[PDB]
């Protein structure tokens, strides 16, 4: 009887706090035809240490 | 028998506070709730909400929320209505309901006129007003009494203590900077006037001013 009712023991309230989102990581979806490979290939000739 | 009274006429200003009561009678308080229904000064009624009285839990109208109440006193079977940081726009008549629930009520309350105004109590202006020439149509001579800036209300205009009421209509009053203006005019015929007297008795005794103007030909 002293807050807010003339009932004891029990009550109800909803408690709303809007969101607010200060960082977010974000995912990636590879598709397969979207895939370089870059291959270095070589063959050894006459070479320097350059 | 059922029959809920309230505070009566109520003189308020802006930025003030009041609480409205509302007693009720032949029943016990706390089995019904008190809808609470404001009108508007457009003659709107707008429906401020229902305190569940048992518990005595106030349900308010969302639009009337937080600046109203609605409390209660279970002994003597008052229901009141509180009001914090009182507005002009509220000035208007206040009422409460014996609740039938989903049905409403089969009782209205006496009813609460709240006036939220910023003036000085004033004796009003009773002019007596001559009528002229052309004021004179088919055999009567209209007579009229001018009643301008009086606080607060009510006034009771008469005629001669009353005595004629024949053509006597008593107009209301509205607002000019917070005071009131009305008029009341008397039909009498062309044979009454100026042979016999016609005075108009303003009453205001809420300025305690009872004036007596007699109308003189020109």
């Known amino acids: 009887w002293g807050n807010g009712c003339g009932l004891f023991g029990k009550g109800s309230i909803d408690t709303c706090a809007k969101f607010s989102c200060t960082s977010k990581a974000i995912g990636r979806t590879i598709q397969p035809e979207n895939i370089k490979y870059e291959v270095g290939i070589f063959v050894h000739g006459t070479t320097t240490s350059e | 028998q059922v029959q809920l009274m309230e505070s009566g006429p109520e003189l308020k200003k802006p930025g003030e506070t009041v609480k409205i009561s509302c007693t009720t009678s032949?029943?016990?308080?706390?089995?019904?709730?008190m809808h609470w229904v404001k009108q508007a000064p457009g003659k709107g009624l707008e429906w401020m909400g229902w305190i569940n009285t048992a518990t005595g839990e106030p349900t308010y109208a969302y639009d009337f929320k937080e600046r109203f109440g609605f409390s209660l006193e279970t002994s003597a079977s008052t229901a009141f209505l509180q009001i914090s940081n009182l507005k002009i726009e509220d000035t208007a008549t206040y009422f409460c309901?014996?609740?039938?629930?989903?049905?409403?009520?089969?009782?209205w309350g006496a009813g609460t006129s709240v006036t939220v105004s910023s003036p000085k109590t004033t004796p009003p202006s009773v002019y007596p007003l001559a009528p002229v020439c052309g004021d004179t149509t088919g055999s009567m001579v209209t007579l009229g009494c001018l009643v301008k800036g009086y606080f607060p209300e009510p006034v009771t205009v008469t005629w001669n203590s009353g005595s004629l009421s024949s053509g006597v209509h008593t107009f209301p009053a509205v607002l000019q900077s917070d005071l009131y203006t009305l008029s009341s005019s008397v039909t009498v015929p062309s044979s009454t006037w100026p042979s016999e007297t016609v005075t108009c008795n303003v009453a205001h005794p809420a300025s305690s001013t009872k004036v007596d103007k007699k109308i003189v030909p020109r």
């Open positions: 032949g029943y016990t308080f706390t089995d019904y709730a």
């Open positions: 309901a014996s609740d039938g629930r989903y049905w409403y009520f089969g009782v």
